[PDB]
Structure 1
Amino acid sequence: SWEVGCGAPVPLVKCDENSPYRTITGDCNNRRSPALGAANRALARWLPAEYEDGLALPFGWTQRKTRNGFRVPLAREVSNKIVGYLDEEGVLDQNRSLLFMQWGQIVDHDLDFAPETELGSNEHSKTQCEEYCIQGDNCFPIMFPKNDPKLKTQGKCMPFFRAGFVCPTPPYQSLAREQINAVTSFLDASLVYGSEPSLASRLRNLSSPLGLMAVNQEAWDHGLAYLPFNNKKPSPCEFINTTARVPCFLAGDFRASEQILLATAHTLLLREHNRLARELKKLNPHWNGEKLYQEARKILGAFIQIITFRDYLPIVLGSEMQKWIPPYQGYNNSVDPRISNVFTFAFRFGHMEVPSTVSRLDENYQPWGPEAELPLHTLFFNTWRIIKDGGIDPLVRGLLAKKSKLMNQDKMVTSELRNKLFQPTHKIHGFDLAAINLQRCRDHGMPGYNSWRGFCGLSQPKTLKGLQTVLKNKILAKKLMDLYKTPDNIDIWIGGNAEPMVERGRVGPLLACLLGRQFQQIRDGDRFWWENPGVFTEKQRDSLQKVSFSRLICDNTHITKVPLHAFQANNYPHDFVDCSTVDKLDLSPWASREN
C-alpha cells in the first residue's frame, strides 16, 4: 500500500483461444479467466496477509508494536543464534548430487520472482538506506544485533528493499499490500524464453528463419554456444573481476548469472532449444522459424515438467508425494494455477542444500587444474570462470559427481551464503541470505508458523515442550522460544525448515504440505500440461517419457560418461555409463508432411 514503487507492466492481449502454443506472459491458459497464472499479477494468498497495521507495515517495523504481545527478534539475530555453523565436515547429502540443489533453483526461477521495489536509478534513497541505515518507505534495513562482528567491519545494517506490490486501484478502499509475481506460474521454461514479449523477441535469433535462440558471438565453448552477454551497465559480473571484465549472461530470467552453476544450467537449456530447432528443421524443412521456435519451446517446456514431476518431486516429497500428487486425472479449469505468496518462502528450503565449495573436474572426473575447488562466495555473479577458465563441462561434471549439502538442524546455511552473499546492486561479499529470507517473510505479510501448521491440518505447538516434540530437538526448540517467545511468532521460513525431514524426502511435514499442494495445482490447473490430451499426440508422449537430464548433458556437452540417475549421489567410474547406452529423444513423431 501507499503507492511509492508499486505496479508492473501488465500488457492487455486479445487471446488466440485456438493456439496450440502457450503465450509468453501465461495469459489465455485459463479460458474463463485468461489472467490466472500470467506474469506481473499478485501472488495468490492462501491465508490473508498479516501486517503490523493490517495494511502494509511488516511485523518488526515499529519498535513499540508487538506481535501477539511479544517483540519479534531481529532477522540477523535469528540467523546468528540458529542458522550459522563452523564445521563443513560431514555436512554433505550422501544420496543427492549437487544437481539436486541446482534443479531446485531452476524450477523455483521458472515459477516465481518477486522483484525488489525499483526506487529508481540515481538514488539518494539507496544512499539513505545503505549509508545511513534509515528505515522508511521501501527501505526496511536488516539491523545488526549487539556483538555482531559485521558491526566492526560493515556498519549498522545490511540494506534491504521491500518487494514490488500491486498499485492501489480506483475504489482506493483499504486492502492489504499484495506482492507481484514477475514470471508465469506455469512450469513452461519461462526462465529460458522470458515472461515478457519484448525480452522474448530480443532473446530469439530473428536474422535466420530457423527458430533458434540468439547465442554469444564473442565466445564459444570448444564450438558449443554461450548465452549472449547482458550489455546493461554497471555489471555486477564485471565488478567481481574488473581485469577479466566478463559481463553477466542475458537469459529469459533476470537471476541467471547469480551463481556459476545456475548460469551453467541456463547454458545447457539454451543449447537444447537450438539442438531441438535444428533437428526439427531436418525433419520438416517446410516449417518456418515461428513454427520451429514454438515447437522446440513446447518440447523444452514438457522436458522441464517431466524431469520435475518424475525425478525431482519424489525425492523432495518422499513418503508424502502420493498424498499430494496422485496420478494425473486431466486438466481441471477450476484449479487455481497461480503461485501463492507462502510457496515463494517454502521453496527456499534449497538454501539449506547449497554447499561451501564448487569443483571443476577433468574428463576422468579428477580435480581440473590447480584451483579445482573454489569457495562458493567467489562464484556469485561470476561468468569469467566459465568464459576464461575452461567452459561449462568441468562445472557440469562437478554437478554429477559432487554432492548437495544436507539440511541439518545444527548446520542450516553455510557461511558462504550466511555471511558472504554478494547482491547485484552492492559492492561487498557481506550479505546474509538467511536474514534476508526472514526479513522478506515479514515484508510479504506472512502469517506465522502455527497459522500454516493449522492450514496444513498439523498440530500447533504452544509451549517449549510442544515445540521440542514437533522438532524432535530440545536445544533448537529452546533457542527458538528464547528468540520468539511464542511459536505463533516463528517466521514461516525458519519454522518450516526447522522440522525433521519426512521419510525418503528432503523437507519436513509443513513444507511437504505447502510444496505438495502448489505442485498439484501447477499440473492440474495448466491447460498445456504435457499429459493433457491433445497437447501432444500419444506417440509424442511415448517419445517424451524417455527424456533424462543425463541425455541433456550427452547432447549438449563434450562429456561422454554420465550416470543413469543424475539426481542421486554418483561416483566415477562405477556409477557412470557411456552416453551411447542412454535413451535419446525420438523426434520422428513430430515429422509433418501434407500427404
Structure 2
Amino acid sequence: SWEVGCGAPVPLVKCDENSPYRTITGDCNNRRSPALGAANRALARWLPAEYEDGLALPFGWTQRKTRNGFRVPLAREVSNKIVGYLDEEGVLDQNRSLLFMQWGQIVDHDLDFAPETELGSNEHSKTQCEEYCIQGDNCFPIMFPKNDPKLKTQGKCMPFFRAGFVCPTPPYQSLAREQINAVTSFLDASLVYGSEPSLASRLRNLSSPLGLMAVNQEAWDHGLAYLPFNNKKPSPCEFINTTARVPCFLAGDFRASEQILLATAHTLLLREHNRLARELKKLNPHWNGEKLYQEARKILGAFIQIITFRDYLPIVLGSEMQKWIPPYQGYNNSVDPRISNVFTFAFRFGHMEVPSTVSRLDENYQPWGPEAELPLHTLFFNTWRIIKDGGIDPLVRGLLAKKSKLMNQDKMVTSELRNKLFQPTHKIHGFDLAAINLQRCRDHGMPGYNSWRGFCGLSQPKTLKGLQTVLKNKILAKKLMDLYKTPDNIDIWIGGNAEPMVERGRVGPLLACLLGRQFQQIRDGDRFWWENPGVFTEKQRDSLQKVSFSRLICDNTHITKVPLHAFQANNYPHDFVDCSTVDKLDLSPWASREN
C-alpha cells in the first residue's frame, strides 16, 4: 500500500490556496501535496538508505561489520591518501572567476541544510565526544589513522555529531533514518529572507513601512548598508579575534558568516532588496510595507533563479546541460521539487574549487595594502576584516578578478579546508572538511558509487582496470582500490568528484546527472518559477531577463568597472567595462495600474 504518515514535527499550516506569493516555509507551493518542498521535512530518498543495520547505524560504526565483505577505510585516511596535496602553484582555473565558487555556495545554502543533532547547550555529551572520542548515540568521531601528524598534535580524533532526523530526533522510530532539510527546496532566496516565520520576522525592519529589511547599526560601508550583527552567544566571529569582538552577521541562513566571501555575497543581496523596495515605493507610494517586501522578495527570487539557470548551470554542466535540463515548457504539478539526500553530497563538488587565498583589491584592481592576500583559514567566521579593513568593495573586486581553484585528480581539496578548518563548538583551526564529507555520507546512509552510476545509466566498474578506464587515471584508481577494495564501496562524494570533467563543464558524468536532475525538478516543480505564465507579466519578464551579476555589483558597491560575464575568468582591464555599459533593471513595469 502507501502512507505519508510519519513526520509530524509541525510546521503544519493552513494553505491560502492561491495568494500572490510564496510562504516563507515553502508550504503551499504544490496544491495537491502542500508539504512538498517545505522546510523542516525529510530530504527525499532517490534510492533507499544503506545503513550497517538496515535502519540507522552508519557503515564504519561497528569494527567487525564489513561493507560487501571489506572494512570501510577511515575517512581521514581517504582524506590523507587521495584528497590532499602540498603545492598550490598551477592549481587555479583559467576560465572561472572566484565568483563561480562563491555563487555555488550561495545557491547551495538556498537549497539544503541538514543541521546536527543539537541536544541543546549545557551538555556533557559534547565533552564526552570531543574530550574522549568515545563513539555512542550521536557522537560518531573521525578517528585519526596511525601515521597521521594530527595524532601528535591534536589528539585521537576530530569530533563529529550525527545529523538530526525526522519524527523524533532523540530516540528514533522504525523504518530507515531520514535526515532533515531545514531550508526550502525552492530556489527562492530563502538564504536572504529565511525559511521560518520567526527568523523571517527578525530580518524585517518593521518600524518604517517601506517593506525594507533590518540593516546594521554600528557599521557603515562608505554610505552603504551592512547586514545586522547576530544576537546569540557564544559567537565564533568574536572567538577568532577576541580583541576586535565583531560578531557574526544575521541572515536567512544559519551559516552566513562561515567565510568572509559568503558574508560578502549576503551583503550584495540585502542591499539589492532595499534598493528594490525604496524604488518600488517611489513608483507606488500607495503600496504598504508588506506589499513592498513581497514584491522586492519576488524580484530577488527571480534574480537568483535567472543568474543560476542562465549563467551558472551552463558552465557547471557544460555539454550535459541540455541533456538533463531541457528547455522549460511550464509548471508540472506532479514534479517532486524536494531536494534529495544525494544532492546534498553531489553539490559538495564546490569544496574542490575553493582556492587557498583571498585578496582585497583597490580601484585600479591592484593589491589593497601590504597584507592584501590572506590564507583562507584566517577568514573562517571573520566579520571584522570587513569592518576594519575597508568594507566589501576590496573583496568583491577579488571575486571578479581572481580565479576559482580547478578540480584536479592530484590536488582535490586545499589544506586550508582539509587540515585547518574551524568548527564553532571547538577551539582550533585543525579540522578536515574532506573527512567530514566522507563521514557525513555514511551518517546519511548513502548508497556507494556503483548504485549511483546505475541510477544514472552509467557503467558500474568492478575491477582495478574498469575503474582506471572510468576515472582515466591509473594511480588514482589504484589508491581508491587500495583503500576501498571494491568500487561498490567508494563513498559518493569522492567517487563523483574523482571523475574527469565533461566538455565545457566543471563536473564529471555522474555529478552532472545527479545535479542536472535535481535542478530540473526544482524549476519544473515550482509554481512560483519566474517563467511560469502569470507569475510576472510579459513586460516584467522582459525587464528581468536584462539583470546581470555585473549590474547588481554596480548598484550595490562603489565599483564602476565590472566585466560583462562575471563568472568566467576576467583580467583587468581588457575584460572590464564602465558600469554605464551595463543594462540597468527597468522597474517601470511594476507601476500599479489600479484606477
- Short-chain TM bin: over 0.9
Matched-pair contact (CA < 8 Å) for 1:539–1:589: yes
Partners of 1:8 and 1:57 in 2: how far apart? 23
Q: Measured at CA, do residues 379 and 169 of structure 1 come closer, stay the same or move farther in structure 2, by a change above 3 Å?
A: closer
Q: Give the RMSD, CA atoms, in angstroms.
A: 2.4
Matched-pair contact (CA < 8 Å) for 1:8–1:40: no
Q: Measured at CA, do residues 51 and 431 of structure 1 come closer, stay the same or move farther in structure 2, by a change above 3 Å?
A: same
How does the TM-score come out when normalised to structure 2? 0.98
Matched-pair contact (CA < 8 Å) for 1:261–1:395: yes
Shift, 1:18, TM fit: 1.8
- Whether 2:245 is the aligned partner of 1:245: answer yes
Partners of 2:530 and 2:152 in 1: how far apart? 54
Aligned match of 1:486: 486
Partners of 1:172 and 1:345 in 2: how far apart? 23
SS of corresponding position for 1:266: helix
Shift, 1:217, TM fit: 1.0
Q: Measured at CA, do residues 172 and 313 of structure 1 come closer, stay the same or move farther in structure 2, by a change above 3 Å?
A: closer
Partners of 2:215 and 2:47 in 1: how far apart? 43
Partners of 1:534 and 1:389 in 2: how far apart? 46
Shift, 1:170, TM fit: 15
SS of corresponding position for 2:374: strand
Partners of 1:10 and 1:587 in 2: how far apart? 39
Shift, 1:120, TM fit: 1.7
SS of corresponding position for 2:17: coil
Aligned match of 1:564: 564
Question: For 1:353-389, what per-residue CA distance to the aligned partner results, in whole angstroms no more than 9, with x for missing partners?
Answer: 0000000000000000111000000000000000111
Shift, 1:214, TM fit: 0.2
Partners of 1:347 and 1:65 in 2: how far apart? 30
Pick which of 274-283 and 166-175 moved more: 166-175
Question: For 1:67-126, what per-residue CA distance to the aligned partner results, in whole angstroms no more than 9, with x for missing partners?
Answer: 011000000000000000011000000000000000000000000000011022011100
Shift, 1:6, TM fit: 12
Shift, 1:539, TM fit: 0.5
Shift, 1:7, TM fit: 7.8
SS of corresponding position for 1:131: helix
SS of corresponding position for 1:319: coil
- Whether 2:40 is the aligned partner of 1:40: answer yes
Partners of 2:8 and 2:412 in 1: how far apart? 35
Partners of 1:404 and 1:171 in 2: how far apart? 43
Shift, 1:17, TM fit: 1.2
Partners of 1:577 and 1:301 in 2: how far apart? 27
Question: For 1:328-365, what per-residue CA distance to the aligned partner results, in whole angstroms no more than 9, with x for missing partners?
Answer: 01000000010000000000000000000000000000
Question: For 1:292-340, what per-residue CA distance to the aligned partner results, in whole angstroms no more than 9, with x for missing partners?
Answer: 0000000000000000000000000000001011110100000001000
Partners of 1:499 and 1:35 in 2: how far apart? 36
Matched-pair contact (CA < 8 Å) for 2:9–2:166: no
Shift, 1:465, TM fit: 0.3
Matched-pair contact (CA < 8 Å) for 1:5–1:117: no
How does the TM-score come out when normalised to structure 1? 0.98
Matched-pair contact (CA < 8 Å) for 2:203–2:252: yes
Shift, 1:171, TM fit: 14
Partners of 2:198 and 2:433 in 1: how far apart? 31
Partners of 1:565 and 1:518 in 2: how far apart? 25
Matched-pair contact (CA < 8 Å) for 1:143–1:157: yes
- Whether 2:67 is the aligned partner of 1:67: answer yes
Matched-pair contact (CA < 8 Å) for 1:165–1:180: yes
Aligned match of 1:273: 273
Partners of 1:445 and 1:7 in 2: how far apart? 19
* Structure 1, unaligned runs of 5 or more: none
Matched-pair contact (CA < 8 Å) for 1:284–1:593: no
Q: Measured at CA, do residues 468 and 171 of structure 1 come closer, stay the same or move farther in structure 2, by a change above 3 Å?
A: closer
Matched-pair contact (CA < 8 Å) for 1:5–1:118: no
Matched-pair contact (CA < 8 Å) for 2:167–2:173: no
Matched-pair contact (CA < 8 Å) for 2:213–2:273: yes
Matched-pair contact (CA < 8 Å) for 2:543–2:587: yes
Shift, 1:3, TM fit: 21
Partners of 2:2 and 2:251 in 1: how far apart? 33
- Between the aligned residues of both structures, percent identity stands at 100
Matched-pair contact (CA < 8 Å) for 1:113–1:181: yes
Partners of 2:454 and 2:177 in 1: how far apart? 23
Shift, 1:159, TM fit: 0.0
Shift, 1:424, TM fit: 1.3
Q: Measured at CA, do residues 213 and 351 of structure 1 come closer, stay the same or move farther in structure 2, by a change above 3 Å?
A: same
Q: Measured at CA, do residues 2 and 139 of structure 1 come closer, stay the same or move farther in structure 2, by a change above 3 Å?
A: farther
Matched-pair contact (CA < 8 Å) for 2:27–2:36: yes
Partners of 1:384 and 1:169 in 2: how far apart? 36
Question: For 1:475-516, what per-residue CA distance to the aligned partner results, in whole angstroms no more than 9, with x for missing partners?
Answer: 000000000000000000000000000000000000000000
* Structure 2, unaligned runs of 5 or more: none
Partners of 1:468 and 1:545 in 2: how far apart? 44
Q: Measured at CA, do residues 6 and 27 of structure 1 come closer, stay the same or move farther in structure 2, by a change above 3 Å?
A: closer
Matched-pair contact (CA < 8 Å) for 2:11–2:40: no
Matched-pair contact (CA < 8 Å) for 1:6–1:117: no
SS of corresponding position for 2:320: helix
Question: For 1:408-430, what per-residue CA distance to the aligned partner results, in whole angstroms no more than 9, with x for missing partners?
Answer: 00000000000000011111000
Partners of 1:61 and 1:299 in 2: how far apart? 47
Shift, 1:10, TM fit: 3.1
Shift, 1:5, TM fit: 20
Matched-pair contact (CA < 8 Å) for 1:5–1:119: no
Matched-pair contact (CA < 8 Å) for 2:318–2:504: yes
Partners of 1:310 and 1:11 in 2: how far apart? 33
Matched-pair contact (CA < 8 Å) for 1:119–1:138: no
Matched-pair contact (CA < 8 Å) for 1:129–1:141: yes
Matched-pair contact (CA < 8 Å) for 2:110–2:190: yes
